[PDB]
DNA sequence: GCGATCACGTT
DNA sequence: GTACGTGATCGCA
């Protein structure tokens with residue numbers, strides 16, 4: 162049964178009450194400089210639909226939008242805030258974001274529209290966005306009558322769902338998590354996205370030349386060594402050449418054919434010279450397709466900046482994700498790829514890039530949560546944790562630790578955080594399963610606190626049905642009770658890892674909020690550009706570097722107080738690559 | 742035009 | 753063994 166609402170041709174005073182559910186619709190997935198197709202307002206006086214041209218040109222409405230005392234309840238306020246920033250309009254007073262509330266209540270639901278969130282509370286008087294707009298090539302904004310009813314219904318759902326969601330958040334002790342952490346972070350992320358990062362396109366185009374050239378050489382070398390030409394980018398075609406024509410040994414299978422992953426190829430290299438060339442081709446081709454051509458496709462031609470979109474309500478652990486482009490996976494490990502970062506430059510003349518990253522935050526959080534005496538003392542002495550672990554598991558003094566012993570202790574440390582598995586560690590170190598189990602057993606002997614935590618957290622997950630982080634974020638793990646060994650085992654690793662990865666996420670999010678408050682108090686022009694899970698990237702005038710060198714690390718180190726210190730390394734330079 | 746696979750980049 | 757996003761190929765319209 163249709164929903165009553167006024168299709169306003171002009172903005173009236175009752176539309177500007179100090180409390181309302183607000184819908185500022187942006188249909189385009191990427192909301193940067195995107196159109197706002199309609200507006201809906203629901204308050205004590207009724208339900209309204211306003212045409213964007215009308216509303217956004219009305220002085221009273223714009224003032225209402227920017228008045229922090231006029232509270233708004235929305236779904237994905239960041240989308241609206243950024244679309245409005247591009248139109249030179251400021252959105253303030255958003256006191257409740259249904260998307261973030263739904264996300265905190267249960268990240269697993271994958272709530273991506275008002276309808277999905279509403280379903281959580283048995284409210285179904287609203288259609289999924291996809292049913293209204295369609296998807297793919299058939300996506301499109303419907304006629305006004307249909308559009309207006311959909312927006313009003315979403316505003317109505319939001320108006321109705323606010324109390325129920327806040328009630329459950331409070332019961333879960335997650336009310337401060339939404340109000341003091343996620344919602345304020347949303348506004349910071351919006352400023353970061355809108356600001357964007359400047360890209361030196363000329364530098365990228367030149368790198369693309371060099372790559373395309375040497376890639377052509379390796380491509381030919383590969384055909385010579387194979388005795389014919391084929392699509393190297395085709396796992397199927399490549400498998401034929403390697404495991405059939407060249408008779409290379411099949412050490413690993415995928416499921417539709419042979420595995421040609423770098424992990425396997427590394428082992429096959431000694432058998433034929435084609436393997437190394439294929440690996441090199443794989444490296445170059447990745448940089449060319451994903452980072453050179455890929456970036457160049459999303460740089461704004463007018464400003465030469467890339468404007469990422471941080472998905473704040475997607476990961477099951479509380480970490481942010483980044484898209485179009487994904488700026489949280491720009492090469493750093495290998496030098497050839499690392500040079501891609503020379504393309505990310507300050508947006509203004511005489512400004513520099515400043516980056517600060519937490520050193521081993523996940524292992525430090527683990528030491529804190531597990532209260533492992535050995536591990537806490539190690540960080541208190543600021544020891545090389547990998548060398549210390551090698552010393553303990555292999556029972557030797559520091560001087561007796563060989564590089565290979567450190568490499569393996571390091572691999573054990575990463576496994577411990579991800580949810581240690583004798584099978585997973587074995588694959589990682591290319592060793593026996595029994596040998597891996599022995600390393601793990603030795604580790605727990607040295608860190609009884611970590612062992613106790615791993616055992617206790619799994620039982621707690623089974624008892625309560627979920628695990629939590631420092632700031633009360635939670636992740637339900639129903640598979641923890643499954644009778645299928647594999648399904649259950651994965652759930653157990655999640656129980657071990659989520660509190661760690663999750664608490665590290667909580668901490669850096671808090672540091673971001675604290676940092677922005679400090680920057681404003683000090684009236685610095687410095688501002689956040691990106692966040693890559695455990696690090697923060699900013700840009701600022703060169704004259705602000707010395708101050709940032711003290712301010713940024715301190716804010717990040719003081720975000721939360723743990724049983725062990727939090728350590729922050731920092732660097733700055735003319736490009737992201739130089740901020741090393 | 743789409744979606745399941747494959748691969749590989751980050752933490 | 754965590755947690756992600758993107759690109760090339762290929763089976764099917």
Ligand SMILES: OC[C@H]1O[C@@](CO)(O[C@H]2O[C@H](CO)[C@@H](O)[C@H](O)[C@H]2O)[C@@H](O)[C@@H]1O
Pocket residue numbers: 190191192237240272273274470471472473474475484
């Ligand atoms: O606006 C980001 C916010 O929107 C959701 C809602 O579905 O995702 C949409 O927008 C993202 C950014 O363009 C896309 O990656 C995604 O595919 C699209 O559905 C939320 O998941 C997200 O938090």
Ligand SMILES: OC[C@H]1O[C@@](CO)(O[C@H]2O[C@H](CO)[C@@H](O)[C@H](O)[C@H]2O)[C@@H](O)[C@@H]1O
Pocket residue numbers: 615616619620623641649653
């Ligand atoms: O019990 C020994 C040891 O086994 C683990 C393996 O992850 O858990 C198994 O045994 C528990 C009983 O103590 C069950 O609750 C759990 O479901 C089963 O997988 C460890 O957690 C535990 O320390």
Ligand SMILES: [Mg+2]
Pocket residue numbers: 518519520521695
């Ligand atoms: Mg680091």
